[PDB]
Design an enzyme around this catalytic site. Structure first.
Site, PDB file in Angstrom:
ATOM      1  N   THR B   1      36.313  38.008  50.359  1.00 20.53           N
ATOM      2  CA  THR B   1      37.754  38.205  50.163  1.00 20.53           C
ATOM      3  C   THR B   1      38.154  39.652  50.022  1.00 20.53           C
ATOM      4  O   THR B   1      37.427  40.408  49.384  1.00 20.53           O
ATOM      5  CB  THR B   1      38.270  37.417  48.974  1.00 20.53           C
ATOM      6  OG1 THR B   1      37.784  37.880  47.737  1.00 20.53           O
ATOM      7  CG2 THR B   1      37.767  35.993  48.998  1.00 20.53           C
ATOM      8  N   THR B   2      39.203  40.058  50.806  1.00 28.46           N
ATOM      9  CA  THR B   2      39.553  41.445  50.966  1.00 28.46           C
ATOM     10  C   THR B   2      41.032  41.451  51.360  1.00 28.46           C
ATOM     11  O   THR B   2      41.514  40.550  52.037  1.00 28.46           O
ATOM     12  CB  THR B   2      38.675  42.247  51.941  1.00 28.46           C
ATOM     13  OG1 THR B   2      39.001  43.617  51.940  1.00 28.46           O
ATOM     14  CG2 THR B   2      38.725  41.771  53.429  1.00 28.46           C
ATOM     15  N   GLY B  47      40.516  37.302  45.807  1.00 31.21           N
ATOM     16  CA  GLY B  47      39.937  36.846  44.510  1.00 31.21           C
ATOM     17  C   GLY B  47      39.974  35.393  44.653  1.00 31.21           C
ATOM     18  O   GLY B  47      39.877  34.838  45.759  1.00 31.21           O
ATOM     19  N   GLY B 130      38.790  44.794  47.180  1.00 27.83           N
ATOM     20  CA  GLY B 130      37.962  43.856  47.930  1.00 27.83           C
ATOM     21  C   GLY B 130      36.536  44.453  47.890  1.00 27.83           C
ATOM     22  O   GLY B 130      36.251  45.606  47.619  1.00 27.83           O
ATOM     23  N   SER B 131      35.578  43.545  48.343  1.00 33.26           N
ATOM     24  CA  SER B 131      34.194  43.913  48.708  1.00 33.26           C
ATOM     25  C   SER B 131      34.280  44.452  50.105  1.00 33.26           C
ATOM     26  O   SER B 131      33.280  45.002  50.626  1.00 33.26           O
ATOM     27  CB  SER B 131      33.298  42.685  48.885  1.00 33.26           C
ATOM     28  OG  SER B 131      33.467  41.949  47.736  1.00 33.26           O
TER      29      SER B 131
END
Lengths: 242, 202, 146, 242, 242, 202, 242, 242, 48
Positions: B1-2, B47, B130-131
């Site tokens: 998720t980003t 998230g 985000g990752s």
């Protein structure tokens, strides 16, 4: 007896709250509402007529569903009516969350009264200024009168409002225990017609009924009031000019 | 998720990821994932997904409550700072979401990032929580310039996240992007977005 | 507010109204008359043309205090260190009856000492005693109010 | 004399809350506000001639946004008005929050009727001194009145405040059911003109309105007021000439 | 008699809350305060001349920093001022906690008003008998006067307290909406000078202001104050020729 | 994460990392962790990002309210205690952040460290707080005098931050130096700071 | 009868709640205390001539420590002092706890104004029947009076009690801010003499001060008070001729 | 008064609290209890006189143990006194829990003063109608009297009760500061003999004491009462000769 | 209305003029009405 009535913690020397009694004169400053119990269901009418003709009679109400088989009509303040009906509607549904059996007319009527009793018990709280007529069918047709004292009384034909006095004389004479749905509807309509002292229109009467055979609340349209209103108006005219 | 977020010269554009899996079912089936706060205000979330759906309902209604109450439109700054408080209160249940809240206000154009426990930060350039962020930041600078159109923006934004599909466990094709240009609140949705990633090859 | 009371007085009032100029001539009257409360009148008498010049007689002003004292002290054997301004400051928010009273208190103060002449010391002292009644400051030190 | 209005928990023997009947005569001290319903929208007009010239033209300003399709005007205490409006907004925003459904006008006016009744029923708190007009388009126009007791009434035009009585009679003659926005706007200005017995100007009234065709709240600006003012004063002059 | 007057939860047969009405004249017994608005900012003047010569020249203070950019004057009882400003001051910073934004000049006065409104409704508590003038700059200058009722009126120039009566007349001829900052400030001292109907000394009056170009509270020291108080005195002497 | 603080004859200079990296996550490259509490007070935080900001907002708000109620500008001492009490009362909502409050006040110059578990200790004229702390102390004391001015002070602050960030794989870029000279509140920001350690080269 | 002092939740129609001015009267009937503020400190002197010789004539106390650097003295009920001094001691220490500075003279005074107004505003709790002097040196010598109302007054010198008025007048003539500590002490002893209408003893008055070069609370010992007192009796005698 | 004396929520024009003054008359109703302080201990003498012969002398005592070095006496309501005094025990005990230290006599009086003060402040609770005499020794003898207000006066020879006026007159003439434990021991039985106006027996009195060489509360048994009364009787017969 | 006319004559005697004039009629409208009824009472501070 003067000053025993400035508190609801105060009964009179005669014995009787004259405060609850003055709360029962506030029911009588409402408009006529009549309920008549018949063997095929229970019909409930109320005076939908109000004020000057600017107001819309149809949107104003006097007559509510409470359950999917219980209706109630009010007389007294619109203000107090709203609190009372919102309580009664919530109560009626909660019995179906925690028992799953639609509430008995007797039982809804008792618990609304029980709720009113709690409001006349203390100085920090004022009585309800209304009465309800609780009309339904649980298995057998019933017709109750709630009191701002918080009493419940079984009836077969009754009134609240200013029309109480005319209705009492009317039904003493012409009420029959055994009635069919149609004969009953006219007669109930006839009594109201005496109370307002005037001819009915569909457009200024609100009628709701819960019949035994369906056990469902229904609201009668202007279109299907017309025949009953005819026979009844002709009768009303007959009564107020011999 | 980003999420990705960029300030344009005359707008703001943000975009989110979609068509991955959530729980164990395909996530994008017709899901909302860019939420309308006000007419000229949005929120995009990276998230917990269903937490963001529910929380969206609270901040849209308080954005309408600020507008109805104070006869003065909600500033971008206002809405992020309120979020901070809400996120603090829900710090015990799954509710961890890193949100960017953007739009136009009388202060000019802006996007604020709000940290999981709360904590607004003005960025007037690019942002990515985000990752997917390091990979996002790369793609973003190459044709991102201080001045950029609001229809040159939707291309860059779409690109970045598609490179992040590979850096993330899953995500598909067709994502949400939103443009907010003080003249439109146009939300493109997978059908339109798919065609813009059809120039970007495989 | 009293079934028997209101009507007896009321009948008197509307007679007096008949004679004042209801029909019968005033007869060059020239009334002159007095009331303690203005709000207690019936609508009929209250109005101008029953008494054309409705006059407020208030309680006297600061200067008014001084004017009343001046008159009164000629009646007495007069201060010897005169100053009517000081007294007027303390007596402000009294009445004309109270200027009268203080003067009365001042002379008697002189009888008591057996000086039998009023002087400034007698006047300041008298002022204190009469205003003593009318103010509720003095007493009492505790115990618990200390 | 008597003492039935020294507390709100005391019924009079007459069967009426006398506290509430002076909370009726509390509305009336204030300035006039009118509502008009047509079949194409609903239009809320309130005085803004109130105050002095050492006071802004953007002083209160009655016609508060409650939602993006509900406006409500006030008469009585502006103090008591704000808090009933503040609650009105919360109730409205709850309905979107818990349902994602725009607030129903019938239901908004119900939830407010209960809230003003909370303040009536309890005896350590006074009844509001205020009457509001709840007005909006859910999908059909409504104009309702909520009274100081917290009573629900539907009108097809009414006014609240010192202007009430002039406008009731105007509206009994003049007001129709075939009414269109343009005519209505002029009509409502004519009627406001009877209340203050004087002519209009764009700044001495504020008007909000909710269309049927838009289904949004938009506010009347001073510029937009001007052509409606012009037409309206034609009839104001005539109806103030005998 | 008179009233119907020993509760706040009782209305008179007039329909006026006697209690509140009584407390608004307790404002007038206190300190005077003069507020004035221009389009260069808003200047707030507060009487600091009180009691005997034994008092220090500063008598706290009366012109409180409420937020960074909003200040308020008080009139009426200083005791009531302390508690009403404690929440007010907390509230202005609570806006900054939850929005990080400047608190509206409009929105602050309303929440000041809400405190006093709580104190009108509940019978357990007296209404505070105190009046704030609210001066600040959101983006344009705005002046409001908060009332004990909890009433809210936008002003453009005003006085309250003792100088209420004097200053309403003064401002009819004098006040203008194209005043300069300095001209408005001088006219605000003229207006205070008129309030006591005496000449001024600059060292026993406190004046603070919020401009548009600053949007920061400032205060004008007794050393700086002097020339404005000298041009004020030429015009206060003229007035007191009559 | 690490912060340093020194007391000058005329100022207080403190410094923060302005880019936080943990794994591949960058919270933003414009991320604030320098908080202005008052006109000549600053706070520089090491430890978790989100809890730094959320607690920090509350103390700004406080500085104003005290300032208004007492009618006088806050002590350095006041706000150091205040933070510690708040933190101790809110351990059901723990903020896992190490503060340094300092600035200039009527008492003079000082810098307090406030533990993430509450409590205010006072530091004579040097302080480092965080994981970079061991290397940073000796790096700072080399050119230290109390009479070292603001100009030498901001330079001297970079070297401690710089040592910690270059061995670390968790930081490498992004530093803010805060100068508070009793006349300015400058935030130097990553770019301007960059040429201070471009002097010390690789 | 009045009914505006039957409780505190009321005002008269003049705008003056008589009951909180009656709490003021509590102060007058109780016994003297003087604060004499100069630029070298503040001196605090209070009655200890209380009772007869059955009593301890070194009766504890009228000179309360609130800290080591703020002190307070009293008139009014010393029941209500004992508990207010208690509240005041916790309040000053709570500042020390949460900020760690000497609580300032201004700040203690404003907290205690808030504290009195809590009792003043509710009707279920009476106001304090106590007035307080707060004397300290935060870093500027300062003296305040706090009323039973909750109001805050800065003074150059201030007295309370029975003897309040003569002292006010006494200082009206001699007192100046330029006067020494020695001088300031002896003048307040002359005034303390008038309050009790008799010559002073150094066993009959309790004396504290907060000094500027100490910034500390100290209590004047019996034989160190004796020369200040000794010279005062000469001036006191001359003044008692009159 | 005549209306402002029927609650504790009133003040009066005078400035006192009439409920508390009445409450003090409750104490004047009770019996006499006398304390004497000398430098070698403090002495508490209570009346234990049963009003009918059918009552057990042993319990009707005033003298209540509070800690193991502080005792006290009472006059006023028996009922109020028992809860209050039971409380003062719990207070002495709390001090030992939290400081492991016996409560100072000054501190215990201060605490129990502040317990009566909350019942007087809060208008929802009558003030207690009791006074105490608290005699103990902390390191030196201390003697205090508590008022129904909460007011605290230090004594060295005192009484309360019905007998208060004559015991006061008594210690003015006779009491000396040069008295031993023994000499004052006789003087408190004489003082008790004066008020009751007859020669006493140990069965209508009880003595408890605290000496300084003991630091304990002890109670004087019937065996040990007799010699004090024997010495006392001689001087009691003499004062009834007049 | 009668009393206004009487009072306007009174202002004429005090200024030693026999003729009643226009100014006098306005002074008397002020004198008489004020002493009969206090016309406002301020509602706009309490109400909207």
């Amino acid at each position: 007896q003067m000053g025993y009535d400035r508190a609801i913690t105060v009964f009179s020397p005669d014995g009787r709250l004259f405060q609850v009694e003055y709360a029962r004169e506030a029911v009588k400053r409402g408009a006529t509402a009549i309920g008549i119990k018949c063997k095929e269901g229970v019909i409930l009418i109320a005076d939908k007529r109000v004020g000057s003709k600017l107001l819309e009679a149809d949107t104003i109400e006097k007559i509510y569903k409470i359950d999917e088989h219980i209706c109630a009509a009010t007389s007294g303040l619109v203000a107090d009516a709203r609190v009372l009906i919102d309580r009664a509607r919530i109560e009626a549904q909660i019995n179906r969350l925690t028992y799953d059996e639609p509430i008995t007319v007797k039982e809804l009527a008792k618990k609304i009264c029980d709720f009113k009793q709690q409001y006349t018990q203390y100085g920090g709280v004022r009585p309800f200024g209304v009465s309800l007529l609780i009309a339904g069918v649980d298995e057998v047709p019933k017709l109750y009168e709630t009191d701002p004292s918080g009493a419940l009384l079984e009836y077969k034909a009754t009134a609240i409002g200013m029309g109480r006095n005319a209705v009492t004389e009317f039904f003493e004479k012409e009420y029959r225990d055994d009635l069919s749905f149609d004969d009953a509807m006219v007669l109930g309509l006839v009594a109201m017609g005496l109370s307002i002292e005037s001819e009915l229109v569909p457009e200024n009467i609100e009628v709701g009924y819960v019949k035994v055979d369906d056990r469902t609340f229904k609201e009668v349209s202007p279109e299907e009031l017309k025949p009953y209103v005819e026979r009844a108006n002709e009768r009303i005219r007959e009564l107020l000019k011999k | 998720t980003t999420t990705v977020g960029l300030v344009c010269k005359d707008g703001v554009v943000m975009a989110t990821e979609k068509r991955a899996t959530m729980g164990n079912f395909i996530a994008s089936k017709a899901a909302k994932k860019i939420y309308q706060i006000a007419d000229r205000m949005a929120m995009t979330t990276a998230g917990s997904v269903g937490d963001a759906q529910f929380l969206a309902r609270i901040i849209k209604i308080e954005a309408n409550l600020y507008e109805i109450r104070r006869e003065r439109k909600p500033t971008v700054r206002a809405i992020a700072t309120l979020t901070s408080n809400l996120l603090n209160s829900y710090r015990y249940f799954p509710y961890l979401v890193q949100l960017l809240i953007g739009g136009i206000d009388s202060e000019g154009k802006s996007i604020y990032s709000i940290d999981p426990i709360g904590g607004a930060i003005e960025e007037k350039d690019i942002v990515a929580t985000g990752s997917g962020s390091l990979t996002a930041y790369g793609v973003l600078e190459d044709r991102f310039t201080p001045e950029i159109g609001v229809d040159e923006a939707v291309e860059l934004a779409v690109r970045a996240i598609y490179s992040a599909m590979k850096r993330d466990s899953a995500s598909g094709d067709g994502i949400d992007v939103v443009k907010i240009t003080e003249d439109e609140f146009y939300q493109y949705s997978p059908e339109e977005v798919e065609q813009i990633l059809a120039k970007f090859r495989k | 507010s009293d079934t028997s009371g209101d009507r007896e007085v009321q009948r008197t009032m509307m007679q007096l109204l008949a004679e004042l100029d209801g029909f019968d001539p005033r007869g060059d009257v020239k009334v002159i008359g007095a009331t303690n409360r203005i709000d207690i009148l019936d609508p009929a008498i209250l109005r101008p043309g029953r008494f054309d010049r409705i006059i407020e007689v208030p309680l006297p002003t600061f200067e008014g205090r001084i004017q009343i004292f001046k008159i009164h002290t000629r009646k007495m054997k007069l201060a010897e260190d005169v100053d009517f301004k000081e007294l007027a400051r303390i007596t402000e928010g009294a009445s004309g009856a109270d200027i009268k009273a203080i003067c009365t208190e001042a002379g008697m103060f002189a009888i008591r000492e057996e000086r039998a002449k009023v002087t400034m010391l007698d006047f300041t002292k008298a002022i204190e005693k009469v205003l003593k009644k009318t103010t509720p400051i003095p007493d009492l030190k505790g115990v618990m109010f200390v």
